[PDB]
Design a binder for this molecule. Sequence first.
Ligand SMILES: C[S@@+](CC[C@H](N)C(=O)[O-])C[C@H]1O[C@@H](n2cnc3c(N)ncnc32)[C@H](O)[C@@H]1O
Ligand SMILES: [Zn+2]
Ligand SMILES: [Zn+2]
Ligand SMILES: [Zn+2]
Length: 231
Amino acid sequence: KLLRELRETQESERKPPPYKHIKVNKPYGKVQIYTADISEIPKCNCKPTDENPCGFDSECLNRMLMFECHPQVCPAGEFCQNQCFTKRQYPETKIIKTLQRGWGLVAKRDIRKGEFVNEYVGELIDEEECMARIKHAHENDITHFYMLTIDKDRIIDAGPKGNYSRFMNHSCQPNCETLKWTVNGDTRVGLFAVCDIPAGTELTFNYNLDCLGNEKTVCRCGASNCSGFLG
Ligand SMILES: C[S@@+](CC[C@H](N)C(=O)[O-])C[C@H]1O[C@@H](n2cnc3c(N)ncnc32)[C@H](O)[C@@H]1O
Ligand SMILES: [Zn+2]
Ligand SMILES: [Zn+2]
Ligand SMILES: [Zn+2]
């Protein structure tokens, strides 16, 4: 069978196929977008003279509630360490080729538990649009999906456009998790470490929680607790 011969040839591409490398979510069609003026953004009670103001180990009111400080609002001023999403403060990573799971992402330094790894960025779409894309993909034998739910009727599609977090694969035993933060009046999806991650270890997360279209995809994460699918 010609189709099995096609898979068998399984050659060596030196680069992932094209996508637009974007900094920030980009809305499409009739999706809802939210913004806040400087005045609406919450203000913590950190001082600029604090050990690590608005830092990971700090008692920051904004940090605790998963709100990002604004530069003009924060009482710590420029010494605010709670600006990860806006400043795009990602550990350096590298795209690698895996054997069974296509392209993947590893980091270039050690990452500590709870640390900001990346923002899941992409084309912002509503649910009707997402369902149409999935239906079209399934009809056209497309097996790669990059859909992640923000809330009902807001889905990030990192397929056409995204950043490096689009290369993060699914594991049944992940070292990263998604957490929904409030940044400048809207919801943003961060990737954070669930454990200490040594440099050169593949960065992964559990797609069951928030990703769409993967119900038919067989899992090859290799973990001892592998359930066998991505969704
Ligand atoms: C968000 S992309 C991850 C990066 C992708 N491997 C690439 O090369 O662009 C998700 C897709 O990667 C593949 N994938 C990711 N994790 C996988 C896993 N654990 N087992 C099998 N395929 C996986 C599937 O094609 C899935 O639709
Ligand atoms: Zn603070
Ligand atoms: Zn702050
Ligand atoms: Zn698995």
